[PDB]
Structure formats: structure tokens, C-alpha cells
Symmetry: C3
Subunit: 155 residues, 3 copies
């Protein structure tokens, strides 16, 4: 069995399962997005996948990025019927600077890069080609629902 991947642009990058021990496929950003404190965005990956029916994709966060930054990704559930552009549902959860601006910006590693503008402190800049998320595909059970008045089994 094989999983079809379709690159939707020149900025897209084939997801990578580097190590046979890895559970997921490394997902890359396909755009450069500046994300200020408390701001939400959907980072385009320019990647389409054709997941077979009987599975679900979990487009989810990386432990490193999650633990070292205020970038919060909401785990996306990829259906078999979705052949469109995979988006990373992200938010910069840092508190508003209320004024403090510095000539640098934070990256997904937590380190500081030189920036084109003097932007608010706690601003992250997601660069094109960044390992931003991972895709873990798991089998699903999708039976038919039967309404009963009582079950036949026993916070």
C-alpha cells in the first residue's frame, strides 16, 4: 500500500518520513507568514493527500515547536474525501506586547532572527520550508448508528 501525494505549487514540499521508527510524516509550510501575539492563521502547505477510506489523518503539532514556543496548532482531522490543500490551523498564543517592539522575530525553534520591520515582541515568523507539523494516519471505525432505548452492555 502507498499514499498518493500531490504538490499544488513550487513552494510545496514532499512530507518526509525520515526514520522507519517514526509514526508520522513531517509537514512543511509553503508560505512565509508573520504571526503577531494572539493572532490566528491557517498556514497553507500547498500539499494535497489522497487518504483511503477507512482512515483519518491527524495533522498535528510537533513536541519541540509546541514546548518551546507559543505557537499552538489545532490538530486537523483529514477525511478520505478531502483532496484539497492541507492547512495548518495555528495561533500565536503569546500575550500582547502592548507596545514593546524589537527589530527581531522568533522562529519555530524559539530563536531570534533579524526582521524587515520592527515588530511587536512575541511575534513569530513562520518561514517557507519550516518543519511545522506532522501527519499521523490512523485506521478508523465507521459503523452505522443504531438508536436504542437501552444498551446491551455494562468525568
Amino acid at each position: 500500500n502507498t499514499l498518493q501525494v500531490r504538490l499544488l505549487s513550487e513552494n510545496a514540499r514532499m512530507p518526509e518520513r525520515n526514520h522507519k521508527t517514526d509514526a508520522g510524516y513531517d509537514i512543511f509550510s509553503a508560505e512565509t507568514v508573520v504571526l503577531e501575539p494572539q493572532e490566528k492563521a491557517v498556514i497553507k502547505t500547498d500539499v494535497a493527500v489522497s487518504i483511503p477510506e477507512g482512515y483519518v489523518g491527524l495533522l498535528t503539532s510537533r513536541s519541540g515547536v509546541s514546548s518551546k514556543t507559543h505557537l499552538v496548532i489545532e490538530t486537523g482531522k483529514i477525511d478520505a474525501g478531502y483532496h484539497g490543500n492541507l492547512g495548518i490551523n495555528i495561533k500565536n498564543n503569546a500575550i500582547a506586547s502592548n507596545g514593546y517592539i524589537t527589530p527581531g522575530v522568533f522562529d519555530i525553534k524559539g530563536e531570534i532572527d533579524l526582521s524587515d520591520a520592527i515588530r511587536q515582541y512575541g511575534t513569530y515568523q513562520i518561514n517557507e520550508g519550516d518543519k511545522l507539523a506532522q501527519l499521523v494516519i490512523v485506521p478508523i471505525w465507521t459503523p452505522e448508528l443504531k438508536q436504542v432505548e437501552e444498551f446491551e452492555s455494562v468525568f
Copy 2:
């Protein structure tokens, strides 16, 4: 197999929906109308019980639309097999303290503004009874016996 038993617990409850055979989960609806102000938490009653078979888990989780377009944050709940109680949606309005700013309207799960009966704080969401708020995705699980060891041995692939 190929059947999941569902119990509607009240007149406000609504049968979960698998719209498309291509969908991975079942859409879950709210069984109550809840006003939720900034930074407030609640557990939304669905008035729905399910009987998940042994060897599986339910993931009561968010919808991408609601999550991306609003400040409504659902913490993905893990529904165990043998759990026949009311499924609750673990929700929080993650909007910032609106200070004193109040408007005659409230936000819905779509992000749009509705006219309200009271003048509430800006960023207040109102979850309406019957709203498609979350989805239930059922996944198989591995629940082996645990063996404490001093050192790990290699293991064959699944």
C-alpha cells in the same frame, strides 16, 4: 460490528450524523443553549450516550471551521468503551477579557453576529441548542499487558 448503539437522553438530544460516507467521524450537536463570555469554561451537554465496543476509543474533537473562525476551543475528549453516560463537549471561550466593552449582539459558532436579549461583553459566544459543535471519531486501540523491565528488548513490527 458495522453498528454502533446510540442513546438519546432527552428531547433536546440529536442523533449524530455521518453526512458523507467519506467522512471519518460523526457530527455532534449541542443539546443546550449556552452563553459563554471571554475566558469562560463549560461542558456542553450533548444528551447523547454511545456504547463503544471494547478495543476502541472515541475522540470527541473539534471542527476545523469552528476552531479556525472563532475563539471557541474544544479539548479533545477521550471516550472510553463501556461509557454510557452523557457525552460532554469540553469547551472554553478563549477570547480576551473584553474589559468593559459591551455590544447588543453575540457571536455564533460560525463567527457571525446575532441580535441578543441582553447587552453582553464583546467576544461573547452563544452556543445554540442543536448547533454542530464537535465530531466523534472512533479509532481502534492497543491495550496490552504491562511488563516492568530493567532494560528494553527489541520488538517485532505490528
Copy 3:
């Protein structure tokens, strides 16, 4: 049908499957960590597991802790080939105190316990041995990727 578990210290505790009908294994903290508003930390469990290839661990939250407190755990993905100390990626999401301090601290149950110092309000204290998270293991599909110009059946 067995999973290898290694306890890495005296503070460690064997994960427990609560009713045996349950899907995950309750994980306990092996350390005492005081966590103030908006602070992030990785709570050591001092427990290693060897999950075989073809599975993923979901180190995720408990509904009680999650719904009753401001403690936010990001679900960690435990790969096969990770045989190290399992860490709980946690954050006290309580709002920045205005400067308010009380002689007590909040617990993972939401109740107030007396602490040795007068700390900021909304500060949580995770105690050694606290049932903090659970581990749910699910099978995974890791096929080979084939790039296409257009999708087929």
C-alpha cells in the same frame, strides 16, 4: 500482547489502566512542580515505554483536570523508537496575576492546599504522584508516499 515499561526512578510509578475497559493508561508525575500563571513546563514521569513499530502513543489530558483547572496539556505523540523519559507538555493557562498573592496554591483537582510560600493567585502545584495524564495507544498506517501530478482511484 505485552508492552515493555521501564521505571527510571524511585519517584516513578507503573501506569495504570483504571477499569480495564478503559482505552488509556493513567500516567503519574514523578516530581513536584510549582507552576505560576502563563508558565510552561515539561513534567517528568520517569517512565519509559517501548511501543512497537506500527503504533503511536497519544500522551493526552484527563477530562477532569482539563475541565476543572487551567492546566493545559498538549497531546504528545510517542513514536516507536522513543525509549526515553515520557514528558508531559503542560502549561498553566491561568491569567497573569495583577500581583495578587495568597498563602495557598491550586491542585489538579481544583482545590486549594496550603503552600510554604505566598505565591501568585491562580498558581497550580503539581505533586509527585499526581494522576496527571493518560496514554492512549492506537495503530497507525505508515505507507510509502507516491507523488502524483493528479490523483487516481
